[PDB]
Design a protein around this ligand. Sequence first.
Ligand SMILES: C[C@H]1O[C@H](O[C@H]2[C@H](O)[C@@H](O)[C@H](O)O[C@@H]2CO)[C@H](O)[C@@H](O)[C@@H]1N[C@H]1C=C(CO)[C@@H](O[C@H]2O[C@H](CO)[C@@H](O)[C@H](O)[C@H]2O)[C@H](O)[C@H]1O
Ligand SMILES: [Ca+2]
Ligand SMILES: [Ca+2]
Length: 686
Amino acid sequence: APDTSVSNKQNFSTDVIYQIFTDRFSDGNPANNPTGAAFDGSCTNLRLYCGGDWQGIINKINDGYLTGMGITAIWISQPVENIYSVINYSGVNNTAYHGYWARDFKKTNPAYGTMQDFKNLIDTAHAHNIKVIIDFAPNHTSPASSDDPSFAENGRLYDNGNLLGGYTNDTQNLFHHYGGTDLSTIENGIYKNLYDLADLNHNNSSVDVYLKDAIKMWLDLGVDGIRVDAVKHMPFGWQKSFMATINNYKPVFTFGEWLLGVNEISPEYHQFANESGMSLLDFRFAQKARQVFRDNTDNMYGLKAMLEGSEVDYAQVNDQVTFIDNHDMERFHTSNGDRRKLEQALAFTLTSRGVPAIYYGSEQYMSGGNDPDNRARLPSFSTTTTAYQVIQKLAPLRKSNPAIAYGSTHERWINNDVIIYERKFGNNVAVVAINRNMNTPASITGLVTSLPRGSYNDVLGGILNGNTLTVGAGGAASNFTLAPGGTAVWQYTTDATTPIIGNVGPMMAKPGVTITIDGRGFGSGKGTVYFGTTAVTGADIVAWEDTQIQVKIPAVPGGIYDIRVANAAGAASNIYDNFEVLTGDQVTVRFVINNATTALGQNVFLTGNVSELGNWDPNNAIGPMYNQVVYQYPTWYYDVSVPAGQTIEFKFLKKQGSTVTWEGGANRTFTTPTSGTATVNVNWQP
Ligand SMILES: C[C@H]1O[C@H](O[C@H]2[C@H](O)[C@@H](O)[C@H](O)O[C@@H]2CO)[C@H](O)[C@@H](O)[C@@H]1N[C@H]1C=C(CO)[C@@H](O[C@H]2O[C@H](CO)[C@@H](O)[C@H](O)[C@H]2O)[C@H](O)[C@H]1O
Ligand SMILES: [Ca+2]
Ligand SMILES: [Ca+2]
């Protein structure tokens, strides 16, 4: 089907996501509203339920509020049943309005709707070519005190009505009981509890299998994407086996939230987007966009350096979800902030690389500080605000112009307050000019673009004071003055004669899974897909058309491969690298090694004979292992995704800089479980 189709669950670069807090959008069914102390119909106590639901979203899709804006994907609050308690935290009452305090991952939150209401939402969104992304928060259940079992619902987890267990007297060890995190280390943030939430123990086989069973249930209901909460607070090896469960079953676009502060660049963050099998909410983008367009704490050279730096640091930058604010930030618009600042920041996000997300109420200029004040009920459904019109004119270009959905980003003109960049994909191009200075016009001289000659009209129709661009020979533009606050977008689309790959989804799966390769210029007739030098042709190519190919992963050994497409005429595409072929289905095994004493700067790692363990390469070994919370030094431990049902060979090693010290003796062997969990507990062999 085409790359822009609503049925494309794997890749979202052609979409614009509207992020809805279900409770704060529209109460379409008053009969499902919480009663008593859990409800506030005026929505002035922002920690109570206001009444918004799935019928309210169905209504705003039907009457054209969302589709008039050009939205093609909706991201809603976690749909699962939550605790019913009103918890009083030092005077103020709190409810699960936000969907994050789960008690049954197999049932719906009835304040939002019934399972029939969820089905009706999937089907009415799809009939209007809107994809549906759900939050999924598998790190915890709800507020709990094992010392006081009467507090809230004591973190109890149910499985479709059946109690699996609570936090007090957890003889099954369904939960973690190591105390609360001080966030000092990533290790500390993973196994210790955050706030008062009952942390799930993913090394318990029942919890592992249950969470994997529950995500497949929501995939069977037709969801198109998953946003997973608190990814830096769950074992990276368990999350990799969780992604393999999704990708080897029904692959959908998945991304997580790993929060970064202003001008924080974390290698672990980039490593997670590049290796987990999921992408990330692009905080690096969001924070620099706020410094330049909102806070004025950096200028356009900072913006340029972030766009240029992130194109390299993210192995698949077209999968990162961008935004200028969301549920974990103060709203972009401030009380004394010029609305043009919000309007330019939205135009910047909508024409940039990645998958744009707009937080509900941006188009109505909502302001508010941090939680809960950034989650007020949206005040109006006015269809005529400038911000609504800016999204309406620009959001369609992600479907119609492949330079915007997939293209590279090239700075063509810049100074402290102005940037003009070009997006380019084959011969499709979009050029965007932004002057953030609200009182000084900018004289543009010397602009050269990849546009053919013509008089290009601003796609924004001059509403943000843009102008026509006259382009002559060699892509040279005639000089112009960019108005104060001016933003203009100019574009040209045409056919690709040669194959170009813009995006691939999923990026990690076992042999036989169908992956989706999107781009332009593939042609009508089936050609060849290369995974490395292995060619797959004929019946293994499930679908071929000019913008999308669906092909089965060949039976190649586990490892990472370059993908390349050749059309029927033998013309080959660009390489899309970093694809990981798994050895098979995954299970997460806890590896524990005792008596492994180390020097300062020396850490313990694991490697072995399958690609998941780095294929005996010390530079690709698993670790550094942990050694503080679950087990303490000199015992080291780590949760590692490993192929299910087979005998692996492995050894531990110590690494300090360039020096590797391998365990002596024979190679260790272990037969892994077919999907469930397991622990290996061994002693260092000198
Ligand atoms: C649990 C929180 O998770 C998300 O934010 C994460 C992010 O995904 C991580 O990878 C990142 O690195 O750390 C962030 C912080 O954990 C999500 O976006 C947050 O909004 C989410 N917050 C929830 C959960 C709770 C905790 O029960 C609520 O806070 C309550 O807890 C405190 C202390 O007990 C009380 O004083 C408050 O009054 C409670 O509301 C939040 O309301 C809710 O937003
Ligand atoms: Ca309601
Ligand atoms: Ca955790």
